[PDB]
């Protein structure tokens, strides 16, 4: 039997602000479609009582069950809805039905930065400082709670209503290599113990990323640009990159100490929130 | 300027077996469609003269490079179209107009063995052994041949008009981890040089697969099944792992060798080749 009930909240919250009343769908008006995912249909959501407009994410068991994530899902109830931050996509609780699971989310209106990006080209070295800001922030409260897998690529970081930072959980059912196989975990079994290590290799990488996302606020692409797959590793593992003209000594200094080989010299996030190009530009 | 001119065969070949004659889309009639994959649409094709069935991949220019993988897709071209091997799957040549590319392959009648496996729920130890047999055969063929990436999961591996293997290379694109980005590349850019580093750990991996493969061959599922990715990646680099109880011993002892945590343990391909249990039950 597969359970339903997550260690996560499924409590009624009064938003405007011993067995408990608990959600239900006849909680919510819906509105419009906010997008489909992989395995989630989200949707423009009303709470009756409050009127506070949120996001409803509906997905299907019967789908989860086949495809073998219904595990990790829970997985991901659980941690993400723990997680309290101004700058991580707050996940307020769930409920399921018969063939249902439903996920009450926040609600975040202005898109997300990998759009804003593409918009924009390039952002000014203020709203960039003022994203690691946040980032580096949220990336703290992050390791206090030992969460397992971090992703701040731009297009995994949705924007609030005021242009704040909101690090969503996209992709969370495909972390596995793709493949047209019903179960999606299975394509891990073929990486052999020395390829999964470097999946385990995970503290400093967020500062490894910290840099390559300052790179590409600043520059409007990634650093590591190569035409194939073999190529892409060796300029990586080699940290082999470059800055157009216009990109600031400030900025350049940050990224490329982000960027080391070593994570052992890679700076910490104090001192990323330090830093004296981060401070001058940065509005928080 | 995007190059279409790969190093690779594009002169009409005489199937009944100085510049010459180049392919051209009317040298083909033109069948179903066999499948559609996230860049190639693939038909059943004929050459006119000969009568010889194939299958014909379109590609489109303008989609390829949208999603900046025209260069993956020639050093593809370039590399499978110089594989000459019965077990892997042939490409015999390509060409090219304003808006499409044109891959002439080897026409696989019987579907994938991930499908095959499906319909089977697992397979005896003569099949399995015969499989084995052919795919550490192509194996010892390609390291002569210095590939790049290798793939023998089930559902990379079609099967000819006898019943034969016949390695693909289905995902070429999407070895980079999902993203809804354009182009399929930049999320290489955030994954540090340790774990990148996994990815180019890359020699007797393949001895790892063919006892992942083994295994899942004669059980119908993958060894290292979890809830979770965490769970899973320890399953897998701590090689923890049952057989059922039917399970023979020979085949016991192949995968057993062959799933060893040190990759200097693993056995070589001409190893599998003798192996008892292989000679055995190959009837090949
Ligand atoms: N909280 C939210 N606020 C606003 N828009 C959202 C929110 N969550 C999702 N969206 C939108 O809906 C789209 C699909 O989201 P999502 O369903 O999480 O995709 P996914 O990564 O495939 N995860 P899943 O569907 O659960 O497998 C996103 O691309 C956003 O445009
Ligand atoms: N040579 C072939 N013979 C028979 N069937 C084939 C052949 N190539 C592809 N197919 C079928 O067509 C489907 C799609 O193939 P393909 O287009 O290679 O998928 P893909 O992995 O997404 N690669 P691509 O479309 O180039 O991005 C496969 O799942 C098969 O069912
Ligand atoms: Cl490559
Ligand atoms: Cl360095
Ligand atoms: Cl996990
Ligand atoms: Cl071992």
Redesign the interface.
Same mark, same amino acid.
């Given at each position: 039997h597969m359970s339903y009930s997550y260690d996560a909240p499924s409590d009624f919250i009064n938003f405007s602000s011993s067995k408990k009343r608990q959600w239900a769908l006849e909680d919510f008006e819906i509105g419009r479609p906010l997008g489909k995912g992989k395995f989630g249909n989200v949707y423009l959501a009303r709470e009756k009582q409050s009127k506070f407009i949120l996001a409803l994410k509906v997905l299907f068991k019967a789908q989860l069950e086949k495809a073998g994530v219904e595990?990790?899902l829970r997985?991901e109830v659980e941690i993400q809805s723990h997680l309290r931050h101004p700058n991580i996509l707050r996940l307020y609780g769930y409920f399921h039905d018969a063939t249902r699971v439903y996920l009450i989310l926040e609600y975040a209106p202005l898109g997300?930065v990998?759009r804003e990006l593409?918009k924009l080209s390039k952002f000014d070295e203020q709203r960039t400082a003022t994203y690691i800001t946040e980032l580096a922030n949220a990336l703290s409260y992050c390791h206090s709670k030992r969460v397992?897998?971090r992703?701040i690529?731009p297009?995994n970081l949705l924007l609030g209503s005021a242009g704040e930072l909101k690090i969503a959980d996209?992709?969370w059912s *495909?972390?596995?290599? $793709?493949?047209?196989?019903?179960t999606l975990?299975?394509?891990?079994?073929?990486? %052999?113990? !020395?390829?999964?290590?470097?999946?385990?290799?995970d503290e400093? *990488?967020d500062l490894? $990323?910290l840099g390559?996302?300052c790179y590409?606020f600043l520059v409007g692409?990634? %650093?590591? !640009?190569?035409?194939?797959?073999?190529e892409?590793?060796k300029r990586?593992?080699?940290?082999e990159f470059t800055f157009p003209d216009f990109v600031t000594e400030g900025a350049r200094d940050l990224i490329s100490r982000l960027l080391k080989?070593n994570?052992s010299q890679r700076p910490m996030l104090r001192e990323v929130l330090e830093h004296p190009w981060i401070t001058a530009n940065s509005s928080k």
């Open positions: 595990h990790q997985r997300t990998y593409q397992i897998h992703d690529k297009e996209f992709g *495909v972390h596995a290599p $793709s493949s047209r196989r019903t975990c299975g394509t891990l079994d073929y990486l %052999p113990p !020395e390829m999964i290590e470097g999946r385990m290799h400093k *990488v490894w $990323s390559v996302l590409e692409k990634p %650093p590591f !640009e190569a035409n194939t797959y073999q892409t590793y990586i593992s080699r940290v080989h994570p």
